[PDB]
UniProtKB/Swiss-Prot annotation, chain A:
Residue ranges crossing the lipid bilayer per the database entry: none
Pfam family, one: HTH_Crp_2
One example GO MF annotation: minor groove of adenine-thymine-rich DNA binding
Name recorded for this polypeptide: DNA-binding transcriptional dual regulator CRP
GN (gene name): crp
Keyword Transcription appears in the UniProt entry: yes
Region (Activating region 2 (AR2)): 13-15
UniProt xrefs under InterPro entries: cNMP-bd_CS, cNMP-bd_dom, cNMP-bd_dom_sf, Env_Response_Regulators, HTH_CRP, RmlC-like_jellyroll, Tscrpt_reg_HTH_Crp-type_CS, WH-like_DNA-bd_sf
Effect of H15 to A/L: Decreased transcription activation at class II promoters, decreased interaction with RNAP, binds DNA
Domain remarks in the Swiss-Prot or TrEMBL record: The N-terminal domain binds cAMP and is responsible for homodimerization, while the C-terminal domain binds DNA when cAMP is bound.
Site (Activating region 2 (AR2)): E90, K95
Amino acid sequence: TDPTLEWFLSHCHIHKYPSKSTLIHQGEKAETLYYIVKGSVAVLIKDEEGKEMILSYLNQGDFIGELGLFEEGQERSAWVRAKTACEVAEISYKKFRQLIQVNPDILMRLSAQMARRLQVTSEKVGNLAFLDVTGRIAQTLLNLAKQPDAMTHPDGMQIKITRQEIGQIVGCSRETVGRILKMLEDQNLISAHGKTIVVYGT
Amino acid sequence: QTDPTLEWFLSHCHIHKYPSKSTLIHQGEKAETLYYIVKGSVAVLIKDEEGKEMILSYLNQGDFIGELGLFEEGQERSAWVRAKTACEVAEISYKKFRQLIQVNPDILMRLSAQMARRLQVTSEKVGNLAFLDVTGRIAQTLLNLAKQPDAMTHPDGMQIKITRQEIGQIVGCSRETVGRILKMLEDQNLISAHGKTIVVYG
Ligand SMILES: Nc1ncnc2c1ncn2[C@@H]1O[C@@H]2COP(=O)(O)O[C@H]2[C@H]1O
Ligand SMILES: Nc1ncnc2c1ncn2[C@@H]1O[C@@H]2COP(=O)(O)O[C@H]2[C@H]1O
């Protein structure tokens, strides 16, 4: 029973998107705000040749498309792709600005998300500047093995993730991931010849 | 410049002076206060595990600082903020600012516009660190420095004043590596250097 949210949503139009669909294309002019009613999405950027990196996952209760709201004529800063089937609310910036005047609390909620995103994204900068691709992948595997969904393994922790997915986390090709996983395995730090990846130590 | 809404806000603030190099905000402090730069500029810094500093952003006259803890009590400052020139900085408790928002939400709109711009800029830096080689990282850094308020017009582009150390802290390289790359960009006729002065070609 969140009256402000239900009220906000009643001014949106809501649509279903299947997994893998693209909600937002980078470079499109930004005139509308989104809100995830159900599902999860990936926010992605690309280099000149199409190599992808994930800036963030966003989930139920997250706003999307907010970055052009405060100045007209801006473009979308990233792609947003559905990672699961999603239900996503959309509203024009013009209408949302009307809602803000009615109850500023809806803006407070959006701004709280933007603040968190800046904190999380700033933490990434430190890592990318200081580590090379091997160090980025190594750090990523340790980070994944410390998440709640990591599984225990007699030898440490076990994670399930594709070379493609790791590549999207660090901004490199699935091939480069493959080469580096083999090197870490030869350094006795992980086992990947299995199905999942085992990260040695807890 | 200024308007009555900013002056209204400022009349609720205490204004304090900070000499160059003095630290306004230390990482880890309890966040309870919002700042606004009335005059001067600052650097926002974070550190690597080894304690080496990185420059995350510059901020200038008209920028809010210390905003990231406003939306949820109990948070810590996410970075250090240090005066780059002599500074005059307005300050107000989060509690009093949240009262002002309820009186006139436009002051929150102004803060949120800067948070959105910061997320765009920091996300672009994440892509640059992830994707570009060290040479390209530095070349893009010089282009970005040329957009700062203190950069000066020049026949062939913009003129900036910056040290090997500062560039290194922005891209995460040694002063040695920066020097070597600057010499290359100069040979590639992308810039011209003179002591600590650099002309960045358009
Ligand atoms: N670093 C980030 N963290 C979380 N989401 C982001 C980040 N960068 C971009 N986005 C989201 O991706 C959206 C792309 O379109 P917009 O720029 O309009 O709004 C953007 C944000 O909703
Ligand atoms: N990525 C960033 N870009 C611009 N300013 C930042 C960035 N990260 C942190 N800051 C600023 O540094 C301040 C540190 O204190 P706060 O976390 O309260 O608020 C932070 C922001 O004002």
